[PDB]
Amino acid sequence: NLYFQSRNFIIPKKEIHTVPDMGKWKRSQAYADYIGFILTLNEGVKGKKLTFEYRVSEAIEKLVALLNTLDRWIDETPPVDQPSRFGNKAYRTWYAKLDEEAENLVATVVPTHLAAAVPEVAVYLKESVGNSTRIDYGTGHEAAFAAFLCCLCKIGVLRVDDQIAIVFKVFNRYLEVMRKLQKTYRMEPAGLDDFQFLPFIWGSSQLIDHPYLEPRHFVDEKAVNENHKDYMFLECILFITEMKTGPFAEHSNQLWNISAVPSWSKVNQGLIRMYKAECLEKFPVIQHFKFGSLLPIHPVTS
Questions:
Q1: Annotated binding-site members for ATP
Q2: Hey, what domains does the chain have and what are their CATH numbers?
Q3: Which residues bind Mg(2+)?
């Protein structure tokens, strides 16, 4: 992609200020590029297990290392006894470290000739792990992580051969770290799932045309337990059953209803529509999205 020193980068800022601003978002270059990216990754993983032998580049290993740094800091930042009954205030300590170190982290991944991109790209990383004031996490934070990855593709740090690894290695790791934050700091949800959305899209794509596992099986704990290592969708269900009390039909009714859909292809197609409507076109969710040079607010070009 960008082989020569590049300097025209912009610190991303909010542009969806009120509900009327949703039109400029839907027409934006950023939206087109973002949904394009999600769908490109969705096609790439179709029919493949997490154990598929995919290419792992240096950039991918550096991204995993960046996530491991975040994980280490959780370990270094234990929960505290506190008066409040919701999220644990140690999250704020952990978040402060990420906020101060985000550019340094991103610089481990971005080559020298793209140094000027780091401040722009790091804003997406900073925005992808929850809210320090509320100690909550939602699908807007997840979207910020996907936007971070998208930026790295846009500047050529990640390439087309990396697309399986982006989902199966990097995003997969990110979800592990997010689950650890959610559980360790008792984060509140900021609906399909309390916290996530994308892994259900990419995960259902893995299972398209599966010869044995059908959507009805994801609400069978034994099928989940026996197959979760191969399938991101099933790993998400396992986390829910660990986190929630009582019958699945009652605590996760949307997913329960989805388990009745006849095929994973139809699950995938439906989840894409649902994501666009309930995340990307939902002001309270997507108002968080920031726009710079790489994911810009200007109308999409032809």
A1: 134, 139-140, 284, 287-288
A2: 1-191 (no CATH), 192-302 (1.20.120.1150)
A3: 194
